[PDB]
Amino acid sequence: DAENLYFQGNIFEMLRIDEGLRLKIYKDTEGYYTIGIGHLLTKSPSLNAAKSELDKAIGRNTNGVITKDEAEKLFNQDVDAAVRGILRNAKLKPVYDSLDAVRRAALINMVFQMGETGVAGFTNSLRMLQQKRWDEAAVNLAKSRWYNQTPNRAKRVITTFRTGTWDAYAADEVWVVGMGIVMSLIVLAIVFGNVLVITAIAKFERLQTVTNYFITSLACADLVMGLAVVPFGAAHILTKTWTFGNFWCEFWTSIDVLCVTASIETLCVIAVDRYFAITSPFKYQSLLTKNKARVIILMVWIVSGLTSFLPIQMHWYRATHQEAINCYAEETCCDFFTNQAYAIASSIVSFYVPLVIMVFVYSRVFQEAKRQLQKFALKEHKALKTLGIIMGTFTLCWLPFFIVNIVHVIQDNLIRKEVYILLNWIGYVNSGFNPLIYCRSPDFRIAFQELLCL
Amino acid sequence: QVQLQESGGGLVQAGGSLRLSCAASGSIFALNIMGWYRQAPGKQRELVAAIHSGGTTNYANSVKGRFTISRDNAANTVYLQMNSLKPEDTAVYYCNVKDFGAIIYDYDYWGQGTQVTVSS
Ligand SMILES: Cc1ccccc1CC(C)(C)NC[C@H](O)c1ccc(O)c2c1OCC(=O)N2
Ligand code: NA
């Protein structure tokens, strides 16, 4: 065939899209216990009946959790048993032979899902597929109990029967490709934006103010994000696995939490800084020295380390359930699992306490601007819009993740993994936004031009 | 796009009194620092007296006890009282406003400048 280019058309990548890969036992749309790539364990409502059938199939005590390797072997067995089921049947084999490669997979898909016996019950639709009446079979199949239970999956399989191509599955890979370049643009923006801020402050003797000393720290935290955290996370998602062993998996995870903490806590420190800088400028200038500020920065990074490298390297963050035990053992797994204790304690430090202070402080600013020595004019609206961007961008990017992070702790299975990762990535892009928020000063503006000779 | 009108300067005898005055024409943020800076002959620009929108003040260590800054009700006008004038107070006095519209940084508005000459 000479084909090693992506998206070869077959039943394996087709079902992987319809079924998905889930290592721990779950319930399908009907309520039956399924595991791996669409493997029906049992129809018994008991979870212990499910586990007993699973242990019998795998050959060991699994505790409801199998490995990737075990999941794939179950997959191929289930596919081969579907193909063997088709060739053994008297209604499936005549139709199966007379189908093309693409429409053979569409049949296997149905058999794989609702069994050999069930599929052979489609007398009319099989009669149409045999006589090559694809569009009638397509209309007809859409009138079944199968179409009402899993419509999204049925439409794809029906479309595969009608068109005879992989159109309904072809697009799925394009979106992975589009995803990959966007990640690149994120990394680029975070790196370029923050390397600029740090250079501007280090090089120009005039951006050497206390507030900028906090900006530098925020810019440093965002810098390590786009260099270490964001790219490695991108590769982890794109390649579906982790190829740097267990040590760098928890080292990377440590850098993740470290920089997110140091970033948000600095945003908090900046808000407080600007409160005193604005409300009481004479006390602010005399009390807050550059040495005192460099101590504040150290402490923010120390707290950050305490909530990142310390619990993680000492494995205190670790969960105890079987799926977490297996992933910790697997050199190619780096999924994130924590206990209630850590996920709550880290969230309060990394996000919630900074959030509260920032909401409080920025309120005290707006509220104290009303009670100064003073028409409802222009300058106040533009100022209110500024903190609306300052506080709005922070909230919109990090709040949805840390809420969901908590909800996943309270009630398990409530948040699908895809969402938890997307919302985490919406938090990552805040590192790109910050240089557009905290560096609009006329001094930054001038420095930015001279640095790149515009 | 606001303006700063300065007035009050001129010639004055040693030990004489003088009253600078600056009015801010335009819309300035409710939180700001309105004050005066000066450039002595052949010396750098130095803060003289400043006043926060919240009332509090600040002075250079060479004008404390002699110079006093105050402001108006809502007209945003600032008056600088300069008593016991010395020859080292001979300079160019600029009226300044630090507007905190952006929160993160501060926007400076300057005055045109007014000369003050003390007869040594
Ligand atoms: C490794 C992997 C695998 C799948 C998906 C994402 C990831 C990356 C991970 C989850 C490490 N990102 C860390 C996330 O940004 C984060 C930041 C600060 C925090 O305080 C916490 C936190 O995680 C939850 C928490 O309780 N604390
Ligand atoms: Na692992």
XYZ file of C-alpha atoms and ligand atoms in Angstrom:
602
model
C 0.000 0.000 0.000
C 2.962 2.298 0.744
C 0.869 4.439 3.110
C 2.347 5.923 6.297
C 0.657 9.330 6.016
C -1.973 10.248 8.656
C -5.681 9.364 8.455
C -5.722 5.995 6.785
C -9.358 4.947 6.601
C -10.334 1.994 8.784
C -12.550 0.709 11.600
C -9.995 1.256 14.368
C -9.670 5.034 14.168
C -13.378 5.220 13.339
C -14.489 3.500 16.557
C -11.860 5.316 18.628
C -13.679 8.518 17.648
C -17.147 7.087 18.360
C -16.257 5.250 21.590
C -13.271 7.155 22.934
C -10.687 5.714 25.303
C -11.631 5.531 28.999
C -9.473 3.405 31.328
C -11.731 3.389 34.393
C -15.199 1.801 34.263
C -17.962 4.179 33.185
C -21.615 4.129 32.165
C -22.622 4.489 28.522
C -25.698 6.353 27.270
C -27.905 3.402 28.270
C -26.458 2.836 31.738
C -24.500 -0.373 31.182
C -20.956 -0.672 32.556
C -18.462 -0.031 29.754
C -14.674 0.249 29.854
C -11.794 0.991 27.481
C -12.832 1.627 23.894
C -16.509 0.720 24.097
C -16.196 -2.679 25.760
C -19.489 -3.806 27.317
C -18.657 -5.436 30.662
C -22.142 -6.521 31.726
C -25.782 -5.452 31.735
C -26.054 -6.028 35.490
C -26.724 -2.824 37.511
C -24.163 -4.007 40.082
C -20.666 -2.502 39.844
C -19.232 -5.655 41.407
C -20.665 -7.746 38.565
C -18.878 -5.369 36.215
C -15.558 -5.728 38.058
C -15.787 -9.518 38.161
C -16.363 -9.760 34.395
C -13.508 -7.303 33.824
C -11.056 -9.259 35.985
C -12.042 -12.434 34.123
C -11.414 -10.816 30.737
C -8.092 -9.185 31.620
C -6.862 -12.093 33.735
C -5.986 -10.259 36.934
C -7.379 -8.169 39.780
C -7.939 -4.813 38.059
C -10.100 -2.983 40.623
C -12.089 -1.393 37.796
C -9.001 0.050 36.130
C -7.046 -1.379 33.180
C -3.961 -0.068 31.361
C -3.690 1.482 27.888
C -2.070 -1.739 26.631
C -4.938 -3.782 28.084
C -7.527 -1.416 26.620
C -6.148 -1.748 23.086
C -6.044 -5.553 23.308
C -9.688 -5.502 24.395
C -10.383 -3.190 21.449
C -8.924 -5.474 18.762
C -10.504 -8.554 20.297
C -13.875 -6.806 20.279
C -13.338 -5.755 16.675
C -12.241 -9.229 15.559
C -15.178 -10.813 17.394
C -17.406 -8.401 15.473
C -15.837 -9.401 12.169
C -16.077 -13.069 13.122
C -19.674 -12.449 14.158
C -20.473 -10.960 10.763
C -18.936 -13.834 8.776
C -20.722 -16.412 10.947
C -24.119 -14.785 10.402
C -26.345 -15.517 7.400
C -27.743 -11.989 7.065
C -24.507 -10.091 7.701
C -22.045 -11.977 5.489
C -23.899 -11.557 2.155
C -24.113 -7.818 2.781
C -20.586 -7.528 4.227
C -18.894 -9.069 1.179
C -20.801 -6.862 -1.264
C -19.645 -3.714 0.534
C -16.562 -1.599 -0.119
C -13.716 -1.064 2.365
C -15.286 2.095 3.806
C -18.824 0.719 4.061
C -17.477 -2.484 5.603
C -16.214 -0.470 8.554
C -19.637 1.165 8.895
C -21.188 -2.296 9.238
C -18.530 -3.546 11.654
C -19.168 -0.385 13.674
C -22.838 -1.321 14.083
C -22.048 -4.943 14.936
C -19.350 -3.757 17.362
C -21.922 -1.627 19.145
C -25.157 -3.606 19.357
C -23.916 -7.130 18.612
C -24.142 -9.551 15.685
C -27.676 -10.692 16.534
C -29.049 -7.167 16.913
C -27.618 -5.857 13.641
C -29.028 -8.812 11.689
C -32.407 -7.545 12.894
C -32.060 -4.702 10.402
C -33.711 -6.754 7.664
C -34.812 -3.889 5.390
C -31.713 -1.742 5.781
C -29.501 -4.748 5.033
C -31.626 -5.549 1.997
C -30.995 -2.016 0.750
C -27.252 -2.110 1.463
C -27.060 -5.387 -0.441
C -28.698 -3.863 -3.523
C -26.502 -0.768 -3.135
C -29.296 1.669 -2.304
C -27.264 3.837 0.069
C -29.614 6.820 0.398
C -32.672 4.675 1.199
C -30.711 2.702 3.770
C -29.552 6.071 5.136
C -33.100 7.382 5.526
C -34.305 4.034 6.847
C -31.623 3.586 9.506
C -32.457 7.035 10.886
C -35.874 5.659 11.887
C -34.417 3.134 14.350
C -34.061 2.902 18.128
C -30.340 3.145 17.458
C -30.724 6.626 15.985
C -32.705 7.909 18.971
C -30.274 6.680 21.626
C -27.000 7.785 20.036
C -27.939 10.198 17.215
C -24.508 11.842 16.881
C -22.791 8.496 16.384
C -25.558 7.172 14.137
C -25.416 10.183 11.795
C -21.694 9.587 11.226
C -22.222 5.872 10.571
C -25.245 6.531 8.372
C -23.260 9.176 6.460
C -20.469 6.641 6.023
C -23.045 4.260 4.551
C -24.547 6.923 2.286
C -21.445 8.709 0.961
C -19.148 5.689 1.147
C -16.310 7.943 2.217
C -14.693 9.032 5.468
C -16.177 12.536 5.253
C -17.833 12.297 8.668
C -14.515 11.352 10.284
C -12.023 13.157 8.020
C -12.717 16.565 9.543
C -11.910 15.296 13.029
C -8.215 15.306 12.236
C -8.162 18.775 10.630
C -9.253 20.233 14.001
C -6.290 18.601 15.748
C -4.059 20.323 13.174
C -5.747 23.693 13.686
C -5.318 23.173 17.428
C -1.577 22.663 17.066
C -0.764 25.906 15.279
C -2.858 27.919 17.745
C -0.748 26.501 20.572
C 2.352 27.653 18.693
C 0.956 31.190 18.415
C 0.232 31.084 22.139
C 3.802 30.058 22.981
C 5.168 32.680 20.591
C 3.070 35.488 22.074
C 3.886 34.564 25.680
C 7.630 34.292 25.047
C 8.003 37.345 22.814
C 5.727 39.560 24.887
C 7.424 38.745 28.190
C 11.048 38.663 26.995
C 10.315 42.202 25.778
C 8.970 43.403 29.145
C 11.949 42.003 31.059
C 14.434 43.491 28.590
C 12.707 46.890 28.685
C 12.943 47.085 32.479
C 16.491 45.706 32.737
C 17.918 47.964 30.009
C 16.175 51.281 30.637
C 17.212 53.003 33.873
C 13.836 54.843 33.936
C 11.527 51.804 34.135
C 13.286 51.019 37.429
C 10.253 51.798 39.601
C 8.776 49.754 42.469
C 5.662 48.838 40.474
C 7.866 47.658 37.594
C 9.834 45.523 40.059
C 6.610 43.564 40.525
C 5.934 43.563 36.778
C 9.323 41.917 36.212
C 8.353 39.060 38.529
C 4.988 38.674 36.794
C 6.843 38.744 33.460
C 9.353 36.163 34.706
C 6.583 33.818 35.826
C 4.861 34.160 32.456
C 8.181 33.649 30.670
C 8.833 30.231 32.227
C 5.244 29.350 31.363
C 5.671 29.845 27.626
C 9.099 28.195 27.621
C 8.704 25.188 29.911
C 5.034 24.726 30.815
C 3.063 25.600 27.671
C 5.153 23.864 24.981
C 5.615 20.591 26.892
C 1.901 20.573 27.653
C 1.198 21.084 23.962
C 3.333 18.067 23.044
C 1.626 16.025 25.768
C -1.800 16.733 24.249
C -0.835 16.458 20.578
C 1.138 13.209 20.803
C -1.531 11.745 23.135
C 1.222 10.517 25.497
C 4.178 11.632 27.613
C 7.737 10.877 26.498
C 9.973 12.277 29.253
C 9.578 9.650 31.983
C 8.064 10.078 35.453
C 10.646 12.464 36.895
C 10.161 15.193 34.304
C 6.419 14.584 34.430
C 6.244 15.714 38.060
C 9.025 18.238 37.540
C 7.045 19.828 34.717
C 3.835 19.603 36.776
C 5.760 21.386 39.551
C 6.818 24.200 37.200
C 3.174 24.521 36.075
C 1.752 25.129 39.536
C 4.809 27.158 40.562
C 4.477 29.744 37.796
C 0.681 29.954 37.938
C 0.939 30.698 41.669
C 3.776 33.236 41.295
C 1.922 34.925 38.415
C -1.489 35.346 40.086
C -0.050 36.206 43.519
C 2.000 38.924 41.805
C -1.128 40.288 40.078
C -2.462 40.460 43.617
C 0.683 42.204 44.920
C 0.516 44.695 42.043
C -3.113 45.545 42.881
C -2.136 46.267 46.486
C 0.944 48.174 45.294
C -1.149 50.392 43.032
C -3.700 50.937 45.805
C -1.091 52.459 48.104
C 0.626 54.150 45.180
C -2.653 55.893 44.353
C -4.523 56.360 47.645
C -1.537 57.319 49.798
C 1.411 58.138 47.475
C 3.614 59.909 50.012
C 3.592 57.051 52.506
C 3.917 54.586 49.609
C 7.109 56.157 48.289
C 8.814 56.335 51.696
C 7.775 52.959 53.154
C 8.058 50.692 50.102
C 11.733 50.679 49.136
C 13.293 48.623 46.347
C 14.767 46.300 48.977
C 11.418 45.847 50.709
C 9.850 45.068 47.321
C 12.579 42.552 46.480
C 11.705 40.853 49.768
C 8.010 40.767 48.838
C 8.973 39.108 45.535
C 11.125 36.487 47.268
C 8.254 35.599 49.622
C 5.743 35.284 46.770
C 8.148 32.858 45.077
C 8.719 31.053 48.382
C 4.997 30.533 48.960
C 4.791 29.446 45.319
C 7.474 26.811 45.844
C 5.698 25.586 48.972
C 2.512 24.906 46.999
C 4.316 23.410 43.989
C 7.696 21.662 44.282
C 7.385 20.739 47.962
C 4.111 18.785 47.934
C 4.698 17.363 44.452
C 8.301 16.134 44.721
C 7.432 14.640 48.120
C 4.414 12.986 46.442
C 2.047 14.537 49.018
C -0.201 15.811 46.223
C -0.740 12.263 44.959
C -4.133 10.576 44.828
C -4.792 7.072 46.139
C -7.303 5.560 43.704
C -6.258 2.814 41.283
C -6.269 4.972 38.149
C -3.830 7.376 39.827
C -1.683 4.520 41.134
C -1.354 3.118 37.593
C -0.572 6.489 36.011
C 2.120 7.153 38.619
C 3.697 3.818 37.667
C 3.339 4.226 33.908
C 6.334 6.110 32.474
C 4.180 7.405 29.601
C 1.313 8.751 31.727
C 1.284 12.285 33.132
C -2.400 12.870 33.809
C -3.005 15.110 36.794
C -4.466 13.521 39.924
C -4.599 15.051 43.403
C -6.369 14.534 46.715
C -9.094 16.829 48.080
C -6.590 18.276 50.553
C -4.048 19.459 47.966
C -6.488 20.543 45.268
C -8.296 22.763 47.788
C -5.216 24.140 49.546
C -3.413 24.950 46.297
C -6.485 26.583 44.761
C -6.955 28.897 47.744
C -3.303 29.972 47.624
C -2.852 30.085 43.843
C -6.150 31.760 42.986
C -8.827 32.341 45.628
C -6.923 34.426 48.197
C -5.344 36.559 45.440
C -8.798 36.915 43.863
C -10.417 38.185 47.081
C -7.684 40.741 47.825
C -7.782 42.066 44.246
C -11.572 42.410 44.235
C -11.413 44.141 47.612
C -8.525 46.486 46.814
C -9.744 47.555 43.370
C -13.112 48.294 44.962
C -11.528 50.501 47.638
C -9.912 52.452 44.790
C -13.165 53.023 42.895
C -15.010 53.769 46.145
C -12.391 56.230 47.417
C -12.265 58.099 44.109
C -15.876 59.127 44.825
C -15.080 60.650 48.205
C -12.106 62.866 47.279
C -11.931 66.677 47.307
C -14.249 67.060 44.303
C -19.562 66.436 37.339
C -19.936 62.878 36.016
C -17.474 63.484 33.189
C -15.086 61.704 30.842
C -11.994 60.752 32.836
C -13.743 58.432 35.296
C -15.470 56.264 32.675
C -12.177 55.580 30.901
C -10.636 54.694 34.264
C -13.440 52.329 35.234
C -12.992 50.679 31.850
C -9.316 50.088 32.678
C -9.872 47.983 35.794
C -12.722 46.315 33.915
C -10.011 45.060 31.582
C -7.504 44.464 34.380
C -9.832 42.497 36.617
C -11.962 41.191 33.747
C -9.133 39.522 31.838
C -7.850 37.900 35.020
C -11.295 36.597 35.974
C -12.332 35.392 32.524
C -9.086 33.406 32.144
C -8.534 31.815 35.558
C -11.909 31.691 37.331
C -13.517 28.999 35.117
C -10.624 26.598 35.760
C -10.365 26.991 39.528
C -14.117 26.706 39.920
C -14.149 23.504 37.847
C -11.069 22.283 39.714
C -13.099 22.534 42.922
C -16.266 20.999 41.445
C -14.234 17.995 40.296
C -13.090 17.590 43.899
C -16.571 17.764 45.436
C -18.402 15.592 42.905
C -16.371 13.135 40.829
C -17.006 12.627 37.075
C -18.871 15.953 36.847
C -16.218 17.519 34.599
C -15.070 15.774 31.422
C -11.277 15.762 31.057
C -11.338 17.766 27.812
C -12.990 20.715 29.570
C -10.596 20.705 32.517
C -7.706 20.965 30.051
C -9.265 23.654 27.847
C -10.100 25.843 30.830
C -6.560 25.284 32.105
C -5.293 26.521 28.723
C -7.567 29.559 28.843
C -5.664 30.287 32.052
C -2.329 29.850 30.296
C -3.115 32.565 27.745
C -3.410 35.092 30.552
C 0.399 35.085 30.519
C 0.215 36.532 27.020
C -2.378 39.143 27.936
C -0.526 40.556 30.955
C 2.156 42.424 28.955
C -0.728 44.125 27.113
C -2.316 45.115 30.429
C 0.499 46.076 32.797
C 2.820 47.846 30.357
C 0.816 50.613 28.682
C 2.759 53.403 30.420
C 4.339 56.081 28.192
C 7.734 54.831 29.407
C 7.015 51.235 28.442
C 5.610 52.457 25.118
C 8.812 54.351 24.298
C 11.051 51.518 25.499
C 9.193 48.969 23.370
C 9.814 50.922 20.180
C 13.519 51.570 20.767
C 14.098 47.911 21.653
C 12.955 46.707 18.228
C 13.829 49.919 16.320
C 10.365 50.573 14.883
C -5.637 67.370 26.175
C -5.890 69.494 29.336
C -4.151 72.776 30.189
C -2.200 74.144 33.148
C -2.291 77.905 33.734
C 0.533 79.165 35.953
C 0.687 82.605 37.561
C 2.297 84.551 40.385
C 6.023 84.554 39.680
C 8.391 87.428 39.023
C 11.134 89.374 40.748
C 11.324 89.414 44.558
C 13.713 90.713 47.233
C 15.619 88.344 49.530
C 13.320 87.345 52.374
C 10.273 88.464 50.418
C 7.058 86.486 50.007
C 5.537 85.119 46.807
C 2.431 83.130 45.868
C 2.457 80.806 42.860
C -0.886 79.662 41.468
C -1.854 76.924 39.015
C -5.321 76.104 37.682
C -6.077 72.829 35.882
C -8.308 73.343 32.852
C -9.874 70.064 31.757
C -11.019 66.694 33.051
C -8.522 65.123 35.459
C -9.065 61.821 37.304
C -10.418 62.111 40.843
C -7.153 60.683 42.200
C -4.036 62.739 41.446
C -0.973 64.622 42.697
C -0.826 68.334 41.963
C 2.431 70.112 42.759
C 5.436 72.223 41.787
C 8.902 71.374 40.457
C 11.908 73.683 39.997
C 15.135 73.940 37.987
C 17.920 75.972 39.604
C 20.527 77.559 37.281
C 22.679 74.630 36.157
C 20.958 72.072 38.387
C 18.458 69.238 37.864
C 14.667 69.381 38.102
C 13.654 69.025 41.738
C 10.325 68.479 43.498
C 9.338 71.536 45.550
C 5.873 70.938 46.978
C 3.150 68.445 46.063
C -0.431 67.844 47.195
C -2.478 64.646 46.857
C -6.156 64.830 45.891
C -6.878 63.458 49.353
C -5.399 66.497 51.055
C -2.013 65.281 52.308
C 1.169 67.107 51.244
C 4.907 66.637 50.671
C 7.860 69.041 50.458
C 11.566 69.084 49.643
C 13.951 69.111 52.604
C 15.101 72.594 51.583
C 11.681 74.257 51.625
C 10.071 72.649 54.696
C 8.911 75.310 57.139
C 9.242 78.055 54.545
C 7.062 76.843 51.674
C 3.468 75.700 52.069
C 1.141 74.177 49.488
C -2.655 74.211 49.469
C -5.477 73.659 46.987
C -8.966 74.889 46.113
C -12.383 73.296 46.597
C -13.261 71.703 43.264
C -11.706 74.160 40.817
C -8.579 71.955 41.012
C -6.427 75.038 41.593
C -3.208 74.867 43.608
C -1.645 77.759 45.515
C 1.993 77.689 46.590
C 2.896 80.068 49.427
C 6.610 80.907 49.414
C 7.814 82.868 52.455
C 11.343 83.827 53.551
C 12.725 83.515 50.012
C 16.442 82.807 49.607
C 18.827 83.180 46.636
C 18.988 79.372 46.272
C 15.241 79.350 45.606
C 15.838 81.215 42.339
C 14.682 78.853 39.591
C 12.009 77.916 37.056
C 8.795 76.666 38.648
C 6.650 74.149 36.747
C 3.097 73.195 37.706
C 2.575 69.431 37.605
C -0.299 66.946 37.724
C 0.058 63.184 38.204
C -3.147 61.646 36.818
C -3.891 58.016 37.786
C -6.327 57.209 34.975
C -4.633 53.917 34.199
C -4.047 52.701 37.772
C -0.908 50.821 36.769
C 0.993 53.961 35.850
C 0.677 57.744 36.037
C 0.147 60.404 33.348
C 2.092 63.656 33.811
C 0.759 67.050 32.759
C 3.206 69.947 32.947
C 2.879 73.719 33.101
C 4.549 76.198 30.762
C 6.913 77.463 33.461
C 7.256 80.663 35.491
C 10.523 82.347 36.459
C 11.225 83.321 40.063
C 14.244 85.543 40.708
C 15.447 86.362 44.226
C 17.622 89.477 44.610
C 20.716 88.177 46.402
C -0.398 17.679 33.845
C -1.738 17.981 33.229
C -2.469 16.929 32.698
C -3.710 17.173 32.126
C -4.223 18.465 32.079
C -3.488 19.514 32.601
C -2.251 19.273 33.193
C -1.476 20.447 33.750
C -1.773 20.768 35.215
C -3.046 20.109 35.733
C -0.589 20.367 36.087
N -1.910 22.202 35.355
C -1.756 22.774 36.676
C -2.780 23.881 36.851
O -2.440 24.934 35.933
C -2.767 24.349 38.264
C -2.178 25.571 38.568
C -2.160 26.035 39.880
C -2.733 25.281 40.898
O -2.720 25.726 42.186
C -3.327 24.071 40.600
C -3.348 23.605 39.295
O -3.951 22.393 39.096
C -5.085 22.066 39.908
C -4.850 22.459 41.353
O -5.534 21.987 42.249
N -3.875 23.331 41.592
Na 3.512 8.568 35.233
